[PDB]
Amino acid sequence: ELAGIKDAAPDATFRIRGQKLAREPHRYSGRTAMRANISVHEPRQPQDIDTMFTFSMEGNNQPTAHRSQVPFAWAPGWNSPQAWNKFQDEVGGKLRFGDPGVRLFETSENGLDYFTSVPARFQPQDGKWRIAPYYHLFGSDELSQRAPVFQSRMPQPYIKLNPADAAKLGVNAGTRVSFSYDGNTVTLPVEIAEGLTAGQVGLPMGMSGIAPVLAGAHLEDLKEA
Amino acid sequence: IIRTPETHPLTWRLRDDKQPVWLDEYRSKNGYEGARKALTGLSPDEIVNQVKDAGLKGRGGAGFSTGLKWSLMPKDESMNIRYLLCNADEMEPGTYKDRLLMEQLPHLLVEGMLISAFALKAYRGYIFLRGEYIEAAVNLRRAIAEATEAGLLGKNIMGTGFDFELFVHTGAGRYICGEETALINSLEGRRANPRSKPPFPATSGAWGKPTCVNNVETLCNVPAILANGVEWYQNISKSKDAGTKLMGFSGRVKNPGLWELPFGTTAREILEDYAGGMRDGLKFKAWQPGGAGTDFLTEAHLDLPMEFESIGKAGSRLGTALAMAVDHEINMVSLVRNLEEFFARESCGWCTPCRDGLPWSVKILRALERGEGQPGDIETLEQLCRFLGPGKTFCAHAPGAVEPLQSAIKYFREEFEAGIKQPFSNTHLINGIQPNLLK
Amino acid sequence: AFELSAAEREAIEHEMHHYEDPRAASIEALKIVQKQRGWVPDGAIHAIADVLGIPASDVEGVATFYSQIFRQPVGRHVIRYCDSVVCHINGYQGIQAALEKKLNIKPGQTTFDGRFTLLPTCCLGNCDKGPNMMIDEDTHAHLTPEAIPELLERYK
Amino acid sequence: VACNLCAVACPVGCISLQKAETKDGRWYPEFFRINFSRCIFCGLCEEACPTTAIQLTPDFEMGEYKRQDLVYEKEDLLISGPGKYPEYNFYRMAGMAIDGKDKGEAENEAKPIDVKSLLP
Amino acid sequence: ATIHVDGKEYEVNGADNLLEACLSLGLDIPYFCWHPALGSVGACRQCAVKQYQNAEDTRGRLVMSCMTPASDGTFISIDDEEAKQFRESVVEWLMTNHPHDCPVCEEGGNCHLQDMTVMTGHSFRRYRFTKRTHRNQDLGPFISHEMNRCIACYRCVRYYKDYADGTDLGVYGAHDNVYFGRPEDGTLESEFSGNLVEICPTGVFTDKTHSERYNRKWDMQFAPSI
């Protein structure tokens, strides 16, 4: 099934007229002084036997090179991101020699059949709160939330409640409520979400201490802390 | 000076006490007769053809014929939504005509609205005003309400099944709103940046619908053509440009006013026989034929007919035909500095040459006024004048902006050379670097 | 904090009934707020944006694009004098000097009591009777420098 | 100002530095090292410096015992005076706002006109 | 379609404008305001070429290649003397207010205006008057704002409003006091606000995360990745 990945990128023996592809621009600087604080002896340049790129400027990055992988856009006279116009066959279209990436599967001729599993309508039962997922672009991802720059853009950990459910619980906007899931009692402050359907409660998936697997689960013993 | 209706179709119903003409007085003096004829006996395309072969031209300054512009409307019946706009901005300096027709004769404008909106099949009409004409706004709104309660505005106008609605949109004081595409953009509530052509406003104008933008003077000229006929309108003046026009002189003259004359009247008659000549102790130096956005002309150009072709052959524009006279007591550098400061501070900021070259010429002329000119100054001014003409900029505000500068440079270069006193010094010295002394 | 009045909101709705798009009432809404409060405060942009359904960015751009919409507080009267070409020919400079001598302020500033705010303006359309001045809703023609303090004493 | 023009203009590549910013926003090099065992004293860095910060004094006695001591860090490069150019200041010409220099306070810079100003 | 650039015949797509058709052929035409993903508005007036009516036409007319359709049998010239002078003049007019900030700017070495001034051959300055300045805004922890370095090319407003449908950034001001930014200090609300660091041809919008540990583009070891 994974036979397509052979055509994703050419192997490490791929050369453009005998030479490799450069990683850094040809005017890379400081080559004899980046490592001078450790030792004055110039070390071996790192050898990249895995791929067709090299860890130096001794390579090919011409706009007319027959390849699909471009490390960066640079043309003589075009040092801006507008060098991609020189790196395309036509401006605004595809790359000059085809875009990288290969489809793993084609479209099947015959499709599936109709799924008869029609679910019943949602019934808000007492004492159990269904988890509505509120994803955020900054925070839901496992790796992006660890970025210290994202913490300023990170929203505060907030739990969303219907006005009717908030009135039933007697809680306002901003007050702290505590809920337990899988023997883990955590406390969060409350926003009031008008469009949320009653009997649910809204949680931000991917937060610190809140798993994204909680979507669609039920919440017990939600109460004001 | 008597004003018979045969030779003064626009201003023969004026009142001597500077009071507006209301609905009963307008209808007593043959009012809404062309409106009645056009709505009863004439098809809209017949009225468009009559305006086309009557030789009526636009009075906003472009000189474009209105019949040809009305013929650019789409013939598709699926787009029945249509808009007709009046450029009642009148923000060009030296222009005071539209204030005169639309402060004390609003029913003529209303009748022109009705006739042109029926001919264009326009279901709505707007008058894009300016914020500084309060009395004109009050008179237009009162006349519109009076025409509404008299059955001439609204649904089923005079039993013809044509529904037309008229609105007044008071502007907020920006000169670029006088441009027709920018007028449309300001009508929609956006920043008044103009639009590129093609597409024209006729194909897709206000809110994407077919739209016709016309001056106050042209829409006032229309009901006279519809009432007194077309062959009468062609026989008003024996010139290429037919019909009467509001022309007049202003600025240090005995009688700075405004008159209605047939086309082809030479500029000395409007200066001496009507404005009384220049004032006591002031001799003639120059004159602008169209106001702030035209080329200056000398004494020898005073015996020239005020037509589009004659002034265009002379190297200028007729414009609004409201000439301003400059005596010798006013320095040309100061006057051009004031003109360029107005044009630089009324730029819309869309396209680079006008936006970042008019302030440069402003600073150069301000340095010339105080006598701080440097070598290479007039060269920079004529460089800017060459590279701000038609086609280079997005709209025609910048050609009209650099027209007076190049005209005063061509005709009065000795006054600009007097301000060049300082030697050229762009770079201050740096201790430890020998300068590159260019020869 | 800025809260729109009921009369302001009613006038804005009646104005946006006239156009097919609610964005077209932005200039008239800003002018209505300007007429009611002298100038356009910071929360007025958000209020007009929430009423009209258009974002506050283009409302602020419209309010800053047009010179007759004031985004800074002004005095009880706005004296606008025509600095254009014909009034320069007719000599508006003496009128401006008389105004600066009476008000003791430069153009673009307001008096310390909030009475007058002096501003140059565009062509007022009265070039045949120039020079011309424009206090809040009244224009004046054939101005002389000696008649300026007599003219300005009828505005409290 | 740690603009890295000297490092790229150096044909031997014996310059390394890193840009850092203070609280006010001015730019300085976090570190700065020259490999004098590699430098050919070609003077291209001083020619390419847009602030005239780096200069070549008339001093030649730079012999050394070990090659590790030929790498001159920022402690051995910053001197107490302006060197061969006594009165130049890049921040007087620069358009960026720093401590003690507001917007419009540089050479040939007008005061910032606000978009809310009542003047047309 | 068939075009003739400097007397040389080329075959191009007839629907596209002259700017992208000529940039597809490798010809070098200056441009600021036009973007391949945003369309033509004809703002910067930098893309001027000299179009002739027919083959035996010598006068011509200065048009903008981004708003000129690449119709069949078009005759244009790129390196005409008047066209080159006008393009250098447009660069100079953009240079009358650009601050002396290139050593202390993050877009140095990656600046479209730098490459575009060097490409047009403009190197001599004859502007001796003052330069306008603008106060900056706090545009959140990602985008750093420096309004002095703007050239009013209207790319940011066009992308952020027409393309990304963002509502908190726009253009204000007037004739030469145009201000591109938020109406008040605050974080940019759109989820596609990062593309302003390359949509902007100058260093008005800069990557503040990169601006912390900044180094120039020639010092970057790059790689393609996902």
Ligand SMILES: Cc1cc2nc3c(=O)[nH]c(=O)nc-3n(C[C@H](O)[C@H](O)[C@H](O)COP(=O)(O)O)c2cc1C
């Ligand atoms: C900068 C500029 C300002 C203009 N101002 C006006 C104006 O105030 N009134 C007007 O009728 N036309 C004005 N025009 C001309 C319009 O573009 C257009 O000719 C007019 O709206 C209708 O033309 P018409 O006379 O054929 O009806 C202006 C044009 C430009 C370029």
Ligand code: SF4
């Ligand atoms: S010439 Fe350009 S910047 Fe000037 S007013 Fe017209 S479109 Fe606006």
Ligand code: SF4
């Ligand atoms: S003088 Fe030395 S440090 Fe300077 S550019 Fe030349 S080799 Fe590099």
Ligand code: SF4
């Ligand atoms: S020494 Fe000069 S050239 Fe080198 S980074 Fe500093 S300012 Fe730039």
Ligand code: SF4
């Ligand atoms: S901020 Fe950048 S993208 Fe926006 S108009 Fe200015 S130069 Fe263009």
Ligand code: SF4
């Ligand atoms: S954005 Fe301005 S300061 Fe930065 S490199 Fe470009 S021209 Fe220089």
Ligand code: FES
């Ligand atoms: S020039 Fe002042 S009123 Fe027209």
Ligand code: FES
């Ligand atoms: S690229 Fe054509 S005018 Fe901007």
Ligand SMILES: [Ca+2]
């Ligand atoms: Ca590897």
